């Protein structure tokens, strides 16, 4: 609806601050390489012509190490075994895949790993036999809490020899919580006759020990899983070989892009250096914020793409991969489209049961508060996580409140009769700039902690109020036009 040239200028301005801010961050690193090298070990590899990589994120490095050693072979084994089952005995495929998942869990995490996954699943199943929402949620919450206790943690660490395997067990158990909670709640709600046969203990075990999603993979709905595992209609093995090749090309491109970002910009080492963060330029601050969120986006492309590719080979429909974070302009849109699987879990099992969006204003606040509180507790329940949850809860609330206010017939008619449609788009973009500034700030707390958040708040809004703040707001205003204009294509 905007004139073509105006939107073209917005796109140029948006691309401009991304790339110039990236240049600023690249220069600050390469200026403090020696200072950063003695506090953080910069890895040396021949991937980018002699640059050194920052390996401080701990999530990229942890999963990359496990993949080089064990995980890639086990995932590749899953697709080989899955194809053999379909060709030979497709009716029994779910149990074969479950059996492979148990063995793969064992050869990585020992007897204790398989034993603890089974114990959590068994307790959950037995409690679910009571057909109560409340009891199931309490049981899941207690099981989750046991992970984060001091005495339990000491006992767990004695089981393994390297603390790297202990972290893997923690990741695996945290993910399994959502799977068996989902199964137990669906069992509590089952009322149709034909569906009664899909809530047996063997089906729970097959859902839990499904290898592509065992360690970190996204939450996959139980409804999709059960429907495909009973299909007995394979999909032309040649076509599966075709889709594997295309998926591998895109996955390798994403991995190379993430590696490039780490070699060029030491964003993770720099957030670990608070005194340096307080003396870099404001352009450097903006570039560091942008690079952090984009690295997080690309990392989860890779981290969810591998399970997604395996599931598509199996004939499943995985949750959608994240939309690029350079296209997100609001709190509501961000949490609908980044982690689609987790968003679906929260809508079905946390949001609606509390009674969201039906009791009016007060009910919506309470429902959203519960959802954000669980996701904060599920991530570890640290202080910075609660700060992030409070900010995100507040942002979503304000967006919904404003949305309802402008959709009132009186105000809607008044603004329609007095303001042109193009002007209406401009105030929507202007307001989204303030929304997206706060959105970036909240997720910086998630990525870097309370200290990073306080540094950014003081150096963007207080120390540099009249002019630094306005430049950031003006750039985000152009950025928001691009995001809203693009969102008219999927939303």
């Amino acid at each position, epitope marked *: 609806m905007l004139p073509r040239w105006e939107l073209a200028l917005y796109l140029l301005a948006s691309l401009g601050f991304h790339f110039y801010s990236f240049y600023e961050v690249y220069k600050v690193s390469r200026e403090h390489e020696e200072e950063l090298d003695q506090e953080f070990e910069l890895e040396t590899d021949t991937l980018f012509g002699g640059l050194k990589k920052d390996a401080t994120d701990f999530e990229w490095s942890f999963w990359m190490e496990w993949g080089k050693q064990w995980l890639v072979w086990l995932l590749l084994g899953h697709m080989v075994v899955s194809q053999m089952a379909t060709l030979l005995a497709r009716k029994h495929r779910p149990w074969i895949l479950m059996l492979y998942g148990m063995w793969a869990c064992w050869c990585v995490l020992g007897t204790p790993g398989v034993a603890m996954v089974l114990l959590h699943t068994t307790i959950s199943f037995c409690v679910a036999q009571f057909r109560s929402q409340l009891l199931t949620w309490l049981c899941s919450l207690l099981l989750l809490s046991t992970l984060r206790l001091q005495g339990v943690e000491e006992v767990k660490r004695r089981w393994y020899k390297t603390e790297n395997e202990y972290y893997l067990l923690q990741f695996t158990l945290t993910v399994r919580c959502l799977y068996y909670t989902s199964f137990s709640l669906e069992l509590c*709600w*089952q*009322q*149709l*006759p*034909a569906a*009664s046969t899909s809530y047996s203990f063997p089906w729970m075990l097959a859902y839990v020990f499904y290898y592509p999603v065992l360690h970190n993979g996204p939450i996959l709905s139980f409804s999709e899983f059960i429907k495909q595992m*009973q*299909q007995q209609e394979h999909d032309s093995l040649k076509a599966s070989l075709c889709v594997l090749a295309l998926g591998l090309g895109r996955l390798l491109c994403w991995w190379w892009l993430a590696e490039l970002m780490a070699h060029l910009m030491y964003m993770h080492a720099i957030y670990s250096s608070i005194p340096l963060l307080e003396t870099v330029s404001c352009w450097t601050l903006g570039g560091l914020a942008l690079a952090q969120v984009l690295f997080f986006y690309v990392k989860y492309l890779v981290l969810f793409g591998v399970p997604a590719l395996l599931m598509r080979l199996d004939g499943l429909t995985p949750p959608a991969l994240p939309r690029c974070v350079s296209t997100m302009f609001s709190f509501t849109g961000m949490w609908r489209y980044f982690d689609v699987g987790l968003h679906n879990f929260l809508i079905r099992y946390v949001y609606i*049961p509390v009674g969201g969006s039906q009791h009016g204003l007060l009910g919506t606040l309470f429902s959203t508060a519960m959802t954000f509180a669980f996701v904060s507790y599920w991530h570890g329940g640290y202080d910075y996580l609660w700060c992030w949850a409070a900010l995100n809860w507040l942002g979503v609330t304000v967006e919904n409140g404003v949305r309802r206010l402008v959709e009132t017939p009186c105000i809607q008619d008044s603004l329609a009769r007095y303001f042109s449609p193009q002007a209406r788009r401009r105030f929507h973009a202007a307001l989204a700039s303030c929304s997206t500034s706060m959105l970036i700030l909240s997720n910086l707390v998630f990525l870097g902690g309370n200290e990073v958040g306080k540094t950014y708040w003081n150096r963007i809004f207080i120390q540099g109020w009249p002019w630094v703040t306005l430049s950031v707001l003006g750039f985000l205003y152009c950025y928001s036009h691009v995001g809203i204009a693009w969102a008219q294509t999927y939303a």
Partner: antibody
Amino acid sequence: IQLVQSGPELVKISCKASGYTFTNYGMNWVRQAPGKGLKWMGWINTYTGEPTYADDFKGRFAFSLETAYLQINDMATYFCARVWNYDYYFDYWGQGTTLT
Amino acid sequence: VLMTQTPLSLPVSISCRSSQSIVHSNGNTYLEWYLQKPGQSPKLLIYRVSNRFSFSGSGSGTDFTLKIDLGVYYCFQGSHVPWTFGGGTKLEIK
């Protein structure tokens, strides 16, 4: 075990259920027009409150819960029937409401 | 799913036939026979194929049959959404 409906009507039909825990089982609605046979219209989950409708009953009709009391909002007579958990569908039926 | 019953009215064997196989994805065939007296509500007779709810007609495959008071008999499938009722078979008094 009783399912009593809201008499003749000339719109909201009610179905009140007795003798069993109301939240355990779902509730179904069917219609029988004088010139044709039975037609299933849809059902509602009496635990979560989530109904599904047949394709040709979409939009105009809605199911509502008032938990041991269930409502639906065209010369057919409408029956509410309780659906079992497994192995068979319609165990008990209401006596019907005649709509004119 | 659409079904037909034959014959419509027989004085004193009801056959229910479907275009699509009635086997559900879970491995069960959900087909039932209901009896409705004149002026009353339908009553369940055999809770699945060949097994009685409280007669004892049996069938298999696509075609289904019921063997052996006065009323109208309907055949019902629950395996494929939306669930579908039969035409109904009037049973004559004579």
